[PDB]
């Protein structure tokens with residue numbers, strides 16, 4: 016039941032949310048990053064200075080080698096390993112066990128994070144971006160095929176809210192929608208294509224002010240929803256215009272562009288934080304109806320990430336828009352794979368001050384925005 020999935024995620028600010036899983040027989044307990052921005056179930060399977068535990072295939076009576084390697088380079092870093100299958104469960108998830116593909120990472124560069132407390136990665140996106148190719152069934156595909164779990168999951172990412180990185184908590188509800196996790200209406204935007212969880216943004220506003228761009232710029236070359244990115248990441252042209260508008264709303268009080276550049280923290284002390292001077296930001300996502308859209312509106316509390324010190328959690332992108340955790344933390348997000356759509360609703364874990372609230376509001380009519 017869904018009650019038992021509530022609060023089944025943890026993590027440290029900036030270091031991703033993870034869910035406890037078990038792999039093999041007897042069950043090996045690993046914390047696994049919940050990542051909607053990739054499609055491989057891949058787990059540390061050998062000693063690494065940042066890992067205090069890892070998947071030992073040889074200790075699993077139910078392991079099966081696929082005798083096939085996989086190498087996954089990416090911008091920041093890389094990982095490589097050896098493919099197999101084994102029984103997998105999520106203790107605080109559905110009460111089922113599945114035989115899933117598992118990439119046992121044997122080597123890796125700048126992949127694991129010091130102190131993050133996860134040992135692996137649960138790629139929840141689609142086969143199309145799976146490595147080494149699209150024939151390696153992703154975990155969720157296996158789960159749905161092998162069980163009667165409905166082809167849907169939802170993420171309520173809560174952040175930290177009020178020496179060591181703040182802890183975050185959240186819930187990953189698999190196989191349904193938990194009504195206690197949100198208030199108000201759920202609004203849906205179509206998954207444009209089943210690879211990433213790709214969506215379309217049709218408009219963005221900073222404190223009500225339209226950035227007035229060709230909406231193609233918002234989705235250049237794609238816009239995705241990615242729990243495995245911390246930041247709201249924007250294409251260059253949009254980032255610049257965004258930060259411009261933001262710098263203006265908060266003109267009273269100045270910061271070094273080290274801050275705006277997302278590598279330099281700024282601090283007030285104990286509750287002096289002037290949330291009020293930072294503007295809300297609305298992303299309008301395409302509706303299920305051609306000419307409709309709806310907006311999700313996010314507060315400075317979500318895009319200033321605590322490190323009272325914060326880092327600016329909007330950053331520039333050369334690979335399109337990424338609606339990462341700081342955007343998702345306002346909301347209850349439904350990855351309705353079965354109806355090919357992503358719904359958004361105001362989250363029960365509401366990090367709002369007494370003047371503003373994150374919001375999901377629609378419809379808005381917009382009378383072509385994709386790559």
Ligand SMILES: CN1C(=O)[C@@](c2ccsc2)(c2cccc(-c3cccnc3)c2)N=C1N
Nearest residue numbers: 029030031050052053089126241243244245
């Ligand atoms: C953007 N992204 C990645 O770089 C990553 C990926 C997956 C396969 S290769 C790259 C990845 C790998 C390792 C760590 C993290 C990460 C770090 C901090 C916070 N949250 C996630 C993300 N998953 C996504 N979506």
